[PDB]
């Protein structure tokens, strides 16, 4: 039964599965007389609970129920290859040795003698290259990509962060060669202002789950972890030191070849003229972010509506690029 609240008042039982714990911060209770473990039903179930603070032997029955299923997205063997990541092969080679290699032939490290990094850190412009690039390498590895958005872990609620991270390693032990991805680790991190200055263990015990499971016990090639940040200085140096987070992937600007492969894919979804040539207009534009490349395809149709054309001619793409050049200059 789902338990979002538990309390008891003035109950005399018996030492063995006694409970009598008030989960509210007012009138806190504990349990003495030895140690007992009852993960299924401690005494009555129901109003037996734990919630925030740890009390004695109550640990085997945590309140793990929560409608957070909309946060974690589990996708096994994604089919995404190149959409907006066209031209990122420079970063794919960075993810080829530390991701594709241990997830394909992990036995090579026995002859090499070295070890795969416990984690891979992503870096670059905010909101660009940290999404589809992680699923692109997951296809070649035939691994399980689990994306957990850190926006719901921003809460200071006690036990929220350490509970979801613990469940990721549990499901990773069942199936080998899985990828655990943490979206926006800046929203989680190793320490924040509400951890030390506050009386909450949120993020305080969450880093322990990454230290105990990943580096401490669980293997490397079978269970991998990937992070994405907007800056390394927002992470606890304890996790930043080598042995946990080693490689740092930086998103650069694609070249002309990368822009050509992205435009030809979008040209299938959007109506375009059969006589346009993307090897020219794209060359007139300098190196730009992957987010601005999708803007060129969307803005090209806007000038076509003003020009009243069923498709986008070569002059329509020229006005869309000039709008990006004048407003960005990147």
Partner 1 sequence: FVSNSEILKPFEKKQEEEKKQLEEIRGNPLSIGTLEEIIDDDHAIVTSPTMPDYYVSILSFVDKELLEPGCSVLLHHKTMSIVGVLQDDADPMVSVMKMDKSPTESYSDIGGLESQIQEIKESVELPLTHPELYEEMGIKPPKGVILYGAPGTGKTLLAKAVANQTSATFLRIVGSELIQKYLGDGPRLCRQIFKVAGENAPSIVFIDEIDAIGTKRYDSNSGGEREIQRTMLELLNQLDGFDDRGDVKVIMATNKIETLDPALIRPGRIDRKILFENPDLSTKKKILGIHTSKMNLSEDVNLETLVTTKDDLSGADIQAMCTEAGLLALRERRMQVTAEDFKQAKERVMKNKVEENLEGLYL
Partner 2 sequence: ALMYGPPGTGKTLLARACAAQTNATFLKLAAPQLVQMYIGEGAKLVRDAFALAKEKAPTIIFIDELDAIGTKRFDSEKSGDREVQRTMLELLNQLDGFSSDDRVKVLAATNRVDVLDPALLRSGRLDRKIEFPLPSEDSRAQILQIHSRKMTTDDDINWQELARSTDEFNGAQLKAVTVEAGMIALRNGQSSVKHEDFVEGISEVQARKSKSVSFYA
Partner 3 sequence: QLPYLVANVVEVVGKAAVVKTSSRQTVFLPMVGLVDPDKLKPNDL
Annotated binding site for ATP: 124-131
Site size toward partner 3 (CB under 8 A) is: 13
Considering only CA atoms, give the Rg of the chain: 26
Nearest approach, Cβ of 83 to partner 3 (angstroms)?
Answer: 55
28 in contact with partner 3 (CB under 8 A)? yes
Of the listed pieces 24-32, 43-51, 251-259, 260-268, which binds partner 3 according to CB under 8 A? 24-32
Instruction: Assess 286 for contact with partner 2 (CB under 8 A).
Output: no
The entry of partner 2, partner 3, partner 1, none near residue 197 (CB within 5 to 8 angstroms by kind) is: partner 2
**Range list of β-strands (E), the chain:** 73-76, 119-123, 144-149, 178-183, 223-228, 247-250
Q: How far is the CB of 127 from partner 3 (least distance, A)?
A: 44
97 binds partner 2 (CB under 8 A): yes
Enumerate residues 6+ apart whose C-beta is below 8 A from 73: 146, 147, 148, 149
Residue 114 region, left (φ>0) first, then alpha (ψ -120 to 50), else beta? beta
> Which residue number, 81 or 298, has a Cβ lying nearer to partner 1?
298
Cβ atoms of residues 43 and 19 within 8 Å: yes
Distance of closest approach, residue 69 Cβ to partner 2, in angstroms: 30
Q: Is 269 in the site for partner 3 (CB under 8 A)?
A: no
Q: Is 190 in the site for partner 2 (CB under 8 A)?
A: yes
Per-position b or e across 186-207, b if 16+ CB within 10 A of its CB: bbbbbbbeebeeeebbbbbbbb
According to CB under 8 A, which residues from 223 to 252 bind partner 2?
236-238, 241-243, 246
Exactly one of 2, 4, 12, 35 binds partner 3 (CB under 8 A); that residue is 12
Per-residue buried b or exposed e for 102-116, using 16+ beta carbons within 10 Å of the residue's own CB: bbeebeeeeeeeeeb
The yes or no reply on residue 115 touching partner 2 (CB under 8 A) is yes
H or E element at residue 278 = helix 278-284
Q: What span, in angstroms and rounded, lies between the C-alpha atoms of 26 and 8?
A: 12
Per-residue string for binding with partner 3, 31-70, x by CB under 8 A? -x--------------------------------------
Binding site for partner 3 (CB under 8 A): 10-12, 14, 18, 20, 25-30, 32
């Amino acid at each position: 039964h789902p338990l979002q609240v538990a309390r008891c008042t003035k109950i005399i039982k018996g030492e063995d599965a006694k409970y009598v714990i008030n989960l509210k911060q007012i009138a806190k209770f504990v349990v003495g007389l030895g140690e007992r473990v009852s993960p299924t039903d401690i005494e009555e179930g129901m109003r037996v609970g734990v919630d925030r603070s740890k009390y004695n032997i109550e640990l085997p029955l945590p309140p793990r129920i929560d409608p957070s299923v909309t946060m974690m997205t589990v996708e096994e063997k994604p089919d995404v290859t190149y959409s907006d990541v066209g031209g990122c092969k420079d970063q794919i080679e960075k993810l080829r040795e530390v991701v594709e290699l241990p997830l394909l032939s992990p036995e090579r490290f026995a002859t090499l003698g070295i070890d795969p990094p416990k984690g891979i850190l992503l870096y670059g412009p905010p909101g660009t290259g940290k999404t589809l690039c992680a699923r692109a390498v997951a296809n070649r590895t035939d691994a399980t990509f689990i994306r957990v958005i850190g926006s719901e872990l921003v809460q200071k609620y006690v036990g929220e962060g350490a509970r979801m991270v613990r469940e990721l390693f549990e499901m990773a032990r069942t199936k080998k060669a899985c990828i655990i991805f943490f979206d926006e680790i800046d929203a989680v991190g190793g320490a924040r202002f509400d951890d030390g200055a506050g009386g909450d263990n949120e993020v305080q015990r969450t880093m322990l789950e990454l230290i105990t499971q990943l580096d401490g016990f669980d293997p490397r090639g079978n269970i991998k972890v990937m992070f994405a940040t907007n800056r390394p200085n927002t992470l606890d140096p304890a996790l930043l030191r080598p042995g946990r987070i080693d490689r740092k992937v930086e998103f650069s600007l694609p070249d002309l070849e990368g822009r050509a492969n992205i435009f030809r894919i979008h040209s299938k979804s959007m109506s375009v003229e059969r006589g346009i040539r993307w090897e020219l207009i794209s060359r007139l534009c300098p190196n730009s972010t992957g987010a601005e490349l999708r803007s060129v395809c969307t803005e090209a149709g806007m000038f076509a509506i003003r020009a009243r054309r069923k498709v986008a001619t070569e002059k329509d793409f020229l006005k869309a690029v000039d709008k990006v050049i004048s407003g960005y200059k990147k």
